[PDB]
Amino acid sequence: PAVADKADNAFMMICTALVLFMTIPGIALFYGGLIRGKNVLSMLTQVTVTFALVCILWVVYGYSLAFGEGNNFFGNINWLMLKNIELTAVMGSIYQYIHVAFQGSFACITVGLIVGALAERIRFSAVLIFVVVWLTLSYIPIAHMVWGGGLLASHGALDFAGGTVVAINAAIAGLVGAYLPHNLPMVFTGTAILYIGWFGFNAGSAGTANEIAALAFVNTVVATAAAILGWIFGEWALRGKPSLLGACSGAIAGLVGVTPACGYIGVGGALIIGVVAGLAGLWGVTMPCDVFGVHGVCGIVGCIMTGIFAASSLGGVGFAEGVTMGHQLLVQLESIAITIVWSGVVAFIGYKLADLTVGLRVP
Amino acid sequence: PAVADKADNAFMMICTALVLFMTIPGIALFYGGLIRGKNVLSMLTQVTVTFALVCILWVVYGYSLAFGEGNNFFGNINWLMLKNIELTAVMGSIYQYIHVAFQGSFACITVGLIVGALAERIRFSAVLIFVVVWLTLSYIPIAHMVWGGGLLASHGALDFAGGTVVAINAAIAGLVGAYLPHNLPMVFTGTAILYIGWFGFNAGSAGTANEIAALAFVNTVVATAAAILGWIFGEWALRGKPSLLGACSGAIAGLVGVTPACGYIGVGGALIIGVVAGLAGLWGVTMPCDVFGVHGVCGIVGCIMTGIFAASSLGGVGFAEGVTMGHQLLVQLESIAITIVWSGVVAFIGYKLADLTVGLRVP
Amino acid sequence: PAVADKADNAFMMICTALVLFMTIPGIALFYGGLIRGKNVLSMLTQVTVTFALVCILWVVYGYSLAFGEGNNFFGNINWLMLKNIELTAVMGSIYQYIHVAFQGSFACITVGLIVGALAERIRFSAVLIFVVVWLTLSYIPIAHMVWGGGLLASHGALDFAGGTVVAINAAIAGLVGAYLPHNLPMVFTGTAILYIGWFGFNAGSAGTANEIAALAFVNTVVATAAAILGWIFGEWALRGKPSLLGACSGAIAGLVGVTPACGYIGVGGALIIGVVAGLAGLWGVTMPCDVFGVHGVCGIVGCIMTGIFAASSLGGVGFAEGVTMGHQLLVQLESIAITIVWSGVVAFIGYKLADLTVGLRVP
């Protein structure tokens, strides 16, 4: 039976630490610099407490429901509090315990993205109700569909590190919420921490320290850099001069945009995707909930452009056998639509259930 | 003869970097946000300078006296400035040089915990005298007894990553000192950095990237999360609402509390220990020297509960052969008592020697 | 043919992340705390945007020109946008893609050092012109000469991690620029981040997680610590008392000073070099462009003292066969002189070309 590679265990434990770093303190510092000063302490408390909450649900049933074998949409409850996972159980080339932690860290940042923005406007008890509903009925199933052999995986969807599961998912939940900057040095710092953490998010998504981790790494560096220049250029062109928030936003645009693609494309495609994401990001925000705007627009762009740049002819690792580019594009579009709709319905339901129970707006 | 595993070398060099990160800037930023503004620069200077000092003593004689073979209480002086350690010498499954650095990083954070709190009130020259006395006569011997095959090890004490050597040790030295918040975003940031660094502290304590590192990792995530919720819940129950400092304190409570236990217990036990530590932490502080209160109370709780949750029947890795739970508990209690008393006497002696030499209170 | 070691791939991807961390946000936070408050946002924007720029040039032609095989001074254009690098191509014991990223991260921090200081005083378009000229005509060739088998390598120059390529190179470019503190907690934080990142910079320079990485690690800890004490002592002796900025500056002095030496010397030599660098650093600044003063003086000192402490007799790894200490010293001095002069001429040319094109001073 399959044995764990200690190089892969080491790499993926470090990568997990780096993705946890994106939430505590990365996204908290990012939002903390954007939202109103009088609301900062409260937002940091909600982000910390709901981080804790997601860690606990994850171990309790969340991992089992996302990565256990179930149906197209849901796993199982065989792995309650990780029961029936032998300590020496291997998954891929690493101990399954490490897989549990790595996967849970992506749940954390996804919820962090939502809670940092709406903490300002949502009653504390209502944010907790929301997180439970939405993590369970939206993050878990969509993680299952994409990474847990569910519906979208079984149709060949390409999403290396979570254009759909993290970015579009959170953008939508966040925008349904929206519907219902005071310290820029602090914003830069959280962007920097998000950037560094994002190497574990992207490279670690290979599940091993191989050439695919290596390619995801370099593509992360290249797409972020290109998106920064693309945003800044567009800001200089429209606004006369670059801005710090413009630079940071560009960095996030390329990161988001390269997320579904990093392990599939060539550096040339990483560059193109970075430029397009930076401009699309800028275009989008022109039309702190802007954050969901960048994530949504840039994650859509990234997801689509994965179905293009994965092609061998464009420097990519190649589509699966018998899969033309037109097919892959169709599948990317279907994954994106399912994610938008599934997350929105569940977001809507989470917000309504909170509102009926405790009320939504902060008193 | 034993050969180094490059996966283990890589893992443990990264883990060391992460534990150094807990001090520079983690604990400095933590205290910097708590202590009075007019005292911050001075505290950061003392924490930086005494960090340097501990790094130097460690290489000079400290490593040799803690990890050389000696008696029950002290090692030797065979390893002055690491003499007689061949560059290719292996210890466990890593080069001994890496062991030297990893172990020294735990000395650093231990002293950081003490100096950040009392820098406010202690003359600079007096803090330096103190660090030399206490590192040498308390941290070194207790490290030797627990991790260097001394007294407590030879009786089977369980302390995976330093409930006794770091937490209770520093709590006591700190409280003997005490006897003789202005920027909460900064407090959150150092808590976040302590949390991330704490994965190298806990996982790296396996000495290898194996299933025990993996288990220590997951248990770290789970106990911190549970302690956060446990503290916050108790604060909501007693104070009407959660607070940011409450959340951060809870995070530290679970971290401390899971420290002696992380590599020995199951996630179920990690959860229980996290909840208890969060509440005990809150209970303790109710009765910035609060920091030593959490470390002391939570490290005592963690140390005791290791002697319980290590049991195979409760999901743990199992006690040694022929060791009943009652026995392990007795040994945990004896280790805790020896640490409290040994550290206190030496703390007291360090403070008195400083006071007689240069005087203790800042002029 | 040579196969990649996954332990080395993991180690070096993490090390790269750590060196990128030194720039984003390390050096930005360092300068941000030093320069005038009204200039901070602008400096952070320029550091972020030129970081992006260096990442892009690097992938486009920069890597190929530095590490392709060419002549004594320049590589080639065989590796445009990494063309002709097979994804599974190995270099040393890691995938070449990882080598590309690791090497590019050193270009980034080098430019970060220059731009953080002069952003205050240089027109944005002029800093971009400058970076292109200087990275291409100075950083690339000097990287080629030292690490890409060019002139200085072929004569046996010792520079483990970039006393010449990074520190002296940037000091000079920076001082030619100069010729033509408001938040100390923020300065400490960036110093801390530079320190932690510097373990990937120094240890990762072994190209593998072996005993040399291990030695570079420990030597980093020891030289930084010793330089901190050496600076602080000199400040106490001259100024009556230590200061936070004094402590941070000392830390940077030892780091810079041990950079060319870390993988070649013994811990005893690491200690000596640390003390000398801390004092020389202090001496130098006595005679935020001080930053280039420390880097220049301390990098010169470090480079020279590598040619001394590498000796087997002084605990070092040993000079190459047939190389006496006097010879190695001669070669170190020649490398230092070539770097000073090459960088200055190119710096001067970059500043003049910018000035003739867009003008240099901020309007």
UniProtKB/Swiss-Prot annotation, chains A, B, C:
The record marks A167, H295 as: Twin-His motif. Important for optimum substrate conductance. One of its GO terms (cellular component) is plasma membrane. The chain crosses the membrane at residues 10-31, 43-67, 97-119, 124-148, 163-178, 186-205, 213-237, 244-264, 267-285, 289-310, 326-354. It holds the Pfam family Ammonium_transp. One of its GO terms (molecular function) is ammonium channel activity. The record marks F201 as: Important for optimum substrate conductance. SUPFAM superfamilies: Ammonium transporter. PANTHER family: AMMONIUM TRANSPORTER MEP2 (PTHR43029:SF10). Homotrimer. In response to elevation of the extracellular ammonium concentration, interacts and forms a complex with GlnK. Interacts with GlnK with a stoichiometry of AmtB(3):GlnK(3). Sequestration of GlnK is reversible. This is Ammonium transporter AmtB. It comes from Escherichia coli (strain K12). The gene is amtB.
